[PDB]
Ligand code: HEM
């Protein structure tokens with residue numbers, strides 16, 4: 267599920283990201299739209315050009331939702347309950363697309379926090395993102 | 408994760424299986440070895456012919472471990488902690504093979520409890536088995 | 549896909565007994581209940597909110613009938629599957645954007661519906677045969693991607 | 695796989711700067727730490743218990759060097775990938791039994807190692823290019839299954 271060593275690593279390593287969360291969130295979305303362009307179809311009404319204020323704004327939100335998740339890494343399904351209601355009931359994002367946004371976040375961290383990205387952090391941050399993806403793609407409460 | 412309606416359905420539907428758990432467990436393993444024969448390689452020392460006492464015995468155990476899981480469907484990672492230690496640390500079964508044994512259990516139930524196998528039960532029993540598969544393929548404690 | 553004459557005899561025999569009206573309707577009905585995100589593709593079929601609405605929908609059963617028709621066609625020509633499912637691989641890929649993990653899901657729901665109907669007649673040897681068919685059909689209906 | 699001359703220029707330029715000793719060793723090292731069940735294949739490489747043992751193992755780095763060699767070969771002949779990875783698709787399928795989901799995992803770990811080394815030089819356009827390569831190579835190295 268998530269070892270107590272992995273919970274520490276996530277807290278520590280996501281602490282070092284800190285206040286550039288907006289920017290990293292944006293760059294993640296941007297890599298994802300370029301790399302896997304069928305992911306765009308969930309965002310029909312956005313302006314998905316280079317450097318749009320819409321995308322940069324959205325990335326802020328995502329990055330903040332993930333910050334909240336790390337705060338309550340022990341009781342996660344309650345914290346993320348509104349998001350599950352959005353991504354799962356209304357939008358019906360299929361869970362494959364979570365695996366691409368989770369990939370594009372790790373590439374982004376590795377390209378910006380080279381020192382903090384040891385194997386043990388890679389290993390933990392991968393499980394963490396995977397848990398989060400599973401809460402948001404299910405219908406509970 | 409698992410809705411409170413799904414927890415009921417699992418309890419009720421696994422209740423109706425009841426005392427043929429040994430036999431259903433065996434038949435599940437048997438379908439799996441025939442259908443996806445690369446799954447055999449985890450069992451090098453078993454006699455995987457038709458009707459072996461080894462397989463019939465093993466199926467009893469599996470079926471009982473799943474019965475235990477359904478008892479504690481709320482605090483599952485503690486209950487299944489010895490199994491995780493076995494399937495994940497020592498054996499290193501990769502999580503693809505869980506998806507085939509979970510498939511072959513549902514085929515087996517549908518071929519034996521036709522009345523109890525409504526869509527809502529199919530839907531719940533699929534999530535349940537999926538949770539269990541995730542606990543057993545991870546290293547925690 | 550390599551089938552022996554005993555497997556191909558089993559496939560065709562139990563396929564001969566299939567009621568080709570209801571099975572496709574059930575199979576596709578179960579898909580929409582068990583893998584909810586699949587509903588996003590059929591939002592043009594009206595109400596899909598409660599298992600009973602999905603099973604009660606006429607368009608679902610209607611569309612199901614075509615799907616099982618396409619499996620029947622592909623079970624005729626086991627030798628040449630890529631030639632058979634040419635326009636569909638284009639259809640499901642270039643327009644609808646259905647990702648290819650979903651094909652092997654539909655295939656597995658099908659096999660559960662068949663065991664539900666044929667009960668104990670659906671033995672392990674038969675199952676093993678049909679698993680190889682619905683692999684082929686899925687693996688062939690999504691080669692336009694790669 | 696369809697690459698434009700700008701993408702192919704980017705691929706070859708940043709591939710030219712790769713230190714072809716350490717990258718394969720790192721990539722395959724990360725694989726064994728992040729997707730533990732993969733260790734079962736290399737249990738003949740001695741101790742793999744702690745991240746430091748996997749990164750410190752000489753055979754891992756040694757075997758890694760071959761893997762990245764095979765990516766380099768497959769990056770030469772983008773036109774004909776199925777002809778290139780013929781004996782390997784046989785090797786990894788008919789003997790070792792490595793299931794094909796694991797290929798697209800190794801491909802993604804590779805791309806993380808490259809962004810780690812090249813930092814800000816690894817831009818989105820470059821990434822998009824390399825993602826198409828390691829898709830091809832994975833999708834081609836496992837066609838002996840289907
Ligand atoms: C992996 C973690 C993810 C997190 C933490 C996350 C978080 C969020 C949050 C907090 C919102 C609310 C912002 C708002 O109210 O507009 C949101 C909206 C949204 N998310 Fe996500 N998301 C994730 C993954 C995905 C993926 C993979 C997709 C699609 C491929 C997606 C598509 C959307 C869409 C369409 C919206 C609505 C945007 C709109 O209203 O126009 N999300 N997400």
Ligand code: HEM
Pocket residue numbers: 446449450468469472473490494498500504505508509539540
């Ligand atoms: C899906 C739920 C599963 C459950 C509940 C389960 C349960 C169990 C249990 C309780 C045991 C202990 C029996 C003993 O001590 O010998 C066991 C052993 C084992 N299981 Fe599983 N198992 C599952 C899936 C799998 C899968 C998918 C594989 C391989 C493809 C697998 C391979 C094994 C092996 C090799 C053993 C050891 C047998 C031996 O000692 O010779 N299991 N399993």
Ligand code: HEM
Pocket residue numbers: 586589590611614615618619636640644646650651652654655685686689
């Ligand atoms: C695996 C075997 C599958 C077969 C043999 C199959 C067959 C077909 C056929 C023959 C059609 C043409 C019907 C028409 O003219 O609209 C069709 C359309 C369609 N299929 Fe599939 N299909 C398969 C899998 C899937 C899956 C997995 C999905 C979604 C998750 C899907 C979604 C659709 C949709 C949305 C249409 C168009 C619906 C419409 O226009 O009304 N199919 N399929």
Ligand code: HEM
Pocket residue numbers: 732735736757760761764765782786790792796797798800801831832835
């Ligand atoms: C995706 C691209 C991959 C490439 C290009 C690749 C390439 C190679 C090559 C060239 C060899 C021959 C080396 C030898 O003679 O032993 C080899 C062997 C091997 N590969 Fe891969 N491989 C890939 C993926 C994988 C994956 C994902 C696994 C396991 C999860 C794996 C496990 C092995 C093993 C176990 C051997 C034999 C080890 C030995 O005999 O010492 N490979 N691979």
